[PDB]
Structures are given as structure tokens and as C-alpha cells.
Design a binder for this molecule. Structure first.
Ligand SMILES: CC(=O)c1ccc(O)cc1
Ligand SMILES: CC(=O)c1ccc(O)cc1
Lengths: 331, 331
């Protein structure tokens, strides 16, 4: 079994741990959990049936029983936790966005690379059967030559505390834009944009509110997206070429429906678990299964989200928020 | 009755004439028609029950029986036909886009203004009950403070001859972009953009293929749209603020469905006529009825599409196609 250690005990670690505990037991075991104090960790481990509990991440890094660490901390805390894990020899699945700016990402990627160890950013959307089916449509030429891609993700998240906090690097871009960038990047082969234009505005709590971006891609195709922490959007993503459009329906960040040239196709979520903190949370299984296959083949990264692309996604996102003046201390 | 004269006898003049012939007969009469030769005009007049037929537009301009002229010619032929009508004292409803660049529009607007005569661009979408209801939602503050608007209109139109012809000023912008610009302008009070960014590409026949535009509007809100003559898009338009989204469903350029915060509302088309050349063609009635009310109150323009806005829409569109290098002889 792939032996997992869970770093941090917040909402998203719950969902992930819960998902992992539904997988075949000869395939995945949750073996440890760390929090920033011992009691918060004993409670999670009791609630989630994990044999070992730690009051620091370093102690989990050092557990010779953990093979892969899941880093589910909040945005600014990923980098130091990932590095601890990599130094101690663990493969790492890091929550999104892997880092707060590009230099954090290069620094994690370089460590992983130099230590010969697996690192992946948990852009879970990529492993949903509906996204896979979309990649297959693109590979097959079904839409003809491509022309334009589009993504949207906005909700009123102003009452979701850590969504709007300057000190947690929240904001529309880092919470929701990341899904738009990864989608656009995916449809255009992970290629580097030739040019980016941005418009948006700020929110009163120190983060970004609403941001639209235009990306010029090679070969004369382009994307645009819009994200927001105040305005509801349609929350779909599309790609179109000379023979038609393919579209991931709302919710595009955890999609279960693909529409290709008018034809609908549904891809159901696993049955369990059922009361996840975040919607469609059961879909976290797809990436969990993905990390296991990669490790089993001895890969040091995912071909589906390669480290060199995580770096590009972080370059793009930082260029976007620099265009509208939004800075974090880490820059 | 408002006595109409029909300039040009192509597909769109058919639809319009057909619509006019369904209106209360004490409200509208079609009294003449002109074409570039007498036979093409006698045939249309026979087919459409119009008492008088002309082999030049000048002869229709000069008919003292016509009160308002409908100029349904192709893009490059609007300006000379409108001017003939205005010189001869007729009110004019001119098909979209009124002109091929901004100078054509200013020149028509100036003539209309100096002669004390009604001119309107036939942006028919604006008079659809669903668009009216959308304006009302905006006026009521139902979406909260606004944030962002979005529009799309693309279809494969490469087999529609005049859509892709350099010499008819076709292209994505002038055939479909115009609907996106007018929508975006409508949602933001007809205000002038602070800034525009454009990406797109050309089509092999001398026109534009696929174009996306980002418009910065005052008060820290923005729009984006995408149009295309090769790629199918979702063909919807939306606007969102802090309390939700309103959306005109496909087909957004002649909409019958409005979705506001999840709540659907349908607005049926008039019953007749039924086999129009263009979809939802029956909806041309709304603008026809609009021209009559304006003339009855003695207006020299529409408050719904004022001449000063037609000029701004033409400025925007020309700036957009100049950004990607697409020029017509008239520039
Ligand atoms: C921010 C985000 O990814 C998210 C996802 C699911 C929710 O139910 C609420 C918020
Ligand atoms: C280009 C356009 O406005 C249009 C409208 C309706 C159609 O059925 C086909 C094309």
C-alpha cells in the first residue's frame, strides 16, 4: 500500500483523508497526521482512524513509515511544509496553488528534482474523467483547428474567511483563477503564452476581487478567463475550433458533464464519501489514484501536471496579479 | 400609418418587409421598394404586395409618399443610401452596422442632425422584451454593484458567402462582434471605455476570423467578448455583480430567455411571420414598433440607441479591427 501522511488538519485535509479511506486498502493506507499542536492532531486521527499523530510537521516528515506526504495547509504555509518533506525523503502531493509566487514554485521544484523525489501540484480537476475525455477530444481533432478557449469561475466568497484574507494569500486569482489558467494551459498543450493582458479590481480586504485575462498562445489561438470573489459567473469552460465547441459544465473546477458539439456525456462521481466540505469532493480520488500509479512506475513527476508546467502556471498567475498591482510580502 | 419604403431587396429586406406586413395596417404601410434594377424590384413588390417599385434608390428617396426608409443593403452600401434618403427628407432606419468605420457613422449622424430628421441603427436585439427586462434588472440594482460583463457570438459562417468577403466588409467583428459591443455598452450605460485590448486572427478571404476583446469601463468594471466566423461559441451574454448574474441565453443576438439569479423567464416571439431567412426574424417587429413611437413623439433619434452611442459603437469596433491590422479601402 502507498502509505500516506497528512500534513495539516483543516477542511481540505478532512476531505482528502476521507477520500483516501475509501480506496482499496491494499492500494492506500493513511498512516500518520501532523498538525501545529498535538491535540488538534490526536482529535483528527481519532475522528479519521489514523494510527499515528504528531504535533509538528517535522515529526511527520521524519516518520520512516510515510512514503508520500499530502500538504493541505493554507496558501502561504505550503512552501516550508513541502521543503521539510522533500528534505526528509518523502514524495509530496501539494495543494493548489503549489506556491504563492513563481519563486516559491521553482524552489520546491528544484529541491524535488535534486533529491530524486516525486512532487505534484494537486490540480485535481485534471484527473476527472470529464477532463480526460476532453483531452481525448482535442487529441482526436474532433473540433477541427482550434481558435479560442474560455473559462470562468466566480462566486460570492466574501463570507468565506480565508478566501478574502491578505495574510492567507486569498483573492480571486489564487483561489479561483488557478483553475482557469490550468484549464487554458491544458487545452493548448501546456505552451507558454506569447502575451497577457489583464483588467481587474481590488477587494477592500487587500486581495483581488474580479480579474479578467487575455492570453495569446502560439499558432494564432488565444484564451480568456474571468474570476471573481464577489460576482457569480457561469462557471463553465470551453474550447472551440473550426468544427465546433467542447464545454465542461458548471461546476467546471470539478466537472461531471462534457458537451461536445451538442452531444452531452455525464461521468458520475464515486459514491463515497458523501458529506464533503467542498463540492464534488469525492473527485479527489482521481488524483490520489494518479499519485499511486506514478510512484509505482517510479516517476518523479506527473505527465499530466509536469513540474515545468506548474512553474509556468505560477509565472502566469504572478504576472497577472503584478499587472493589477496586487503584491504579497513573499514577492 | 407610418409609410415605409424598402431600400434593397435581399434576404434581410424580405424578413423586414414580411414583419412589417404583419403589423396593424393603421399603424404601418409598405408603400414602395427600390432595387438597383427595375425588374428585381417589380418581382419583390409582386411577391410582397407593395404598390410601387423603383429601379433606383434615388427614386424611392424622392417618392413624396414615403415617410421612413429602411436601408437593408449590404455593409459598404449603407452610407450612400442613407445619405440619399436624408437629403430627400426621409427618416431612416439603417441596418447594422450603420457604417463600415467611424467616419461613415459621423457623416450620417451629422446629416441627420443638420436636417432635423430621425436616424436609427437597427440593432434589433435591444428591443427584444428579454433585453428590456434585462435593462430593468440593471436599473433595479438586483445584481448588486456590477463587476463584469461577457458576450460571445461565433458560428462557422465560412460557407455564407457575404459573411467572409473582403469587399462586403464581412468578418467576425462586423457581422457578429457588433452584437457583443452593443450588449456590453448597454449594460454599462453607453459609457465610453477607458481602454481596449484585442487578440485575434485573420481569415484567408481578407477579413477577421476570431477576435477577443477586453474593455475597461469606468467605475472599475469591465467587459470581454469573443466573436468568430469559424468557431461555434456558447452564444450567450451575461452581466454580474455582487449579488448575482443575469444572462441572455443562446441565441443572445435575438434572445427569448433571460436567467436572473437562477430564475428563468421566457418571452415568446410574435407568431408570424414563420419562415424567415434569419433566425428569430419575427423579432424585427419590436424595432419597427419602436421607430413608429419615436416618430409619433417627434423624436429625431431613439433614446434606446442614441446616435451618439452608434458613433461610440463604431469607434470601438474600428479601434478593435485596427488593433489587429484589418483594414477596408474606406479607412
Ligand atoms: C473556493 C472553492 O474551490 C469552493 C469549492 C466548493 C465549495 O462548495 C465552495 C468553494
Ligand atoms: C450572421 C447572423 O446574424 C445569422 C443569424 C441567423 C442565422 O440563421 C444565420 C446567421
Amino acid at each position: 500500500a502507498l502509505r500516506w501522511g497528512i500534513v495539516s488538519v483543516g477542511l481540505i485535509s478532512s476531505d482528502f483523508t476521507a477520500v483516501l479511506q475509501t480506496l482499496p486498502r491494499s492500494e492506500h493506507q493513511v498512516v500518520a497526521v501532523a498538525a501545529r499542536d498535538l491535540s488538534r492532531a490526536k482529535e483528527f486521527a481519532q475522528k479519521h482512524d489514523i494510527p499515528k499523530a504528531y504535533g509538528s510537521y517535522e515529526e511527520l516528515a521524519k516518520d520512516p513509515n510515510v512514503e508520500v506526504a499530502y500538504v493541505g495547509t493554507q496558501h502561504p504555509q505550503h512552501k516550508a511544509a513541502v521543503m521539510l518533506c522533500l528534505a526528509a525523503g518523502k514524495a509530496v502531493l501539494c495543494e493548489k496553488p503549489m506556491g504563492v509566487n513563481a519563486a516559491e514554485v521553482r524552489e520546491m521544484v528544484t529541491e524535488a528534482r535534486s533529491r530524486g523525489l516525486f512532487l505534484m501540484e494537486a490540480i485535481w480537476t485534471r484527473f476527472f474523467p470529464a477532463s480526460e475525455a476532453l483531452r481525448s477530444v482535442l487529441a482526436q481533432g474532433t473540433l477541427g483547428d482550434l481558435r479560442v478557449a474560455r473559462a470562468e469561475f466566480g462566486k460570492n466568497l466574501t463570507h468565506v474567511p480565508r478566501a478574502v484574507d491578505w495574510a492567507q494569500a486569498g483573492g480571486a486569482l489564487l483561489d479561483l483563477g488557478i483553475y482557469c489558467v490550468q484549464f487554458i494551459s491544458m487545452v493548448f498543450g501546456g505552451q507558454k503564452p506569447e502575451k497577457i493582458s489583464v483588467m481587474g479590481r481590488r477587494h477592500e480586504t487587500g486581495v483581488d476581487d474580479t480579474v479578467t485575462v487575455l492570453l495569446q498562445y502560439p499558432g494564432e489561438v488565444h484564451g480568456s478567463f474571468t474570476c471573481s470573489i464577489t460576482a457569480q459567473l457561469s462557471n463553465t469552460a470551453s474550447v472551440s475550433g473550426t468544427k465546433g465547441m467542447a464545454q465542461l459544465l458548471n461546476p467546471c473546477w470539478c466537472p461531471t458533464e462534457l458537451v461536445v458539439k451538442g452531444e452531452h456525456k455525464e461521468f458520475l462521481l464515486p459514491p463515497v464519501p458523501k458529506n464533503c466540505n467542498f463540492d464534488n469532493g469525492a473527485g479527489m480520488s482521481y488524483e490520489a489514484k494518479h499519485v499511486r500509479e506514478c510512484l509505482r512506475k517510479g516517476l518523479k513527476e506527473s505527465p499530466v501536471i509536469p513540474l515545468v508546467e506548474s512553474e509556468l502556471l505560477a509565472d502566469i498567475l504572478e504576472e497577472v496579479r503584478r499587472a493589477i498591482g496586487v503584491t504579497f510580502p513573499q514577492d
